[PDB]
Structure 1
Amino acid sequence: LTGCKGKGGECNPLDRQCKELQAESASCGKGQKCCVWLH
């Protein structure tokens, strides 16, 4: 469903094994994206 938690989740590198967004990757800025921890 959701690729973050609320305040922003956690910022990770683009070359990572976790979820990704376009609207919330801007919270991390330019060069990172938002990820999750659930399965």
Structure 2
Amino acid sequence: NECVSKGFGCLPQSDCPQEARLSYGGCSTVCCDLSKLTGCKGKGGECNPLDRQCKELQAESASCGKGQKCCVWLH
């Protein structure tokens, strides 16, 4: 099991898209990068202030008030 050790899902080829299909093994069908399927929620995300140049994403941070800038990475 590789996709367990890396921290992804095992969704089928019909459910997840053709691009999210990782090359790792151990699943029942195909591995799917849940970190990169959704957005800020995919790994958990972070609001930081408008003073700090980072990333912008209207999906979640749009009502953060103080620091309406959603940032997320692979880690």
> TM-score per shorter chain, which class?
0.3 to 0.5
Q: Would the alpha carbon gap of residues 7 and 38 (structure 1) be closer, same or farther in structure 2, given more than 3 Å must change?
A: closer
Give the 3 Å change call, closer, same or farther, for CA 20–30 of structure 1 in structure 2: same
Per-residue CA deviations over 1:2-23 (Å, capped at 9, x if unaligned) read: 6524485111011212111122
SS in 1 for 2:48: strand
- Secondary structure of the corresponding residue to residue 41 of structure 2: coil
Larger-Rg structure: 2
Residue 59 of structure 2 is aligned with which of 4, 10, 23? 23
Question: Given the superposition, is the C-alpha separation of residues 21 and 5 from structure 1 closer, same or farther in structure 2, using an over 3 Å criterion?
Answer: same
Coordinate RMSD, CA, aligned: 3.4
List alignment gaps of at least 5 residues for structure 1.
none
Q: How much identity, in percent, do the aligned residues show?
A: 100
Paired residues of 2:48 and 2:67 also in contact (CA < 8 A): no
Gaps of 5+ in 2: 1-36
Contact 2:49 2:66 in 1 (8 A): no
Query: Aligned pair in 2 of structure 1 residues 38, 6: CA closer, same or farther (>3 Å)?
Result: closer
On the 8 A contact 1:18/1:36 being kept in 2, the answer is no
Q: Which has the higher strand share?
A: 1
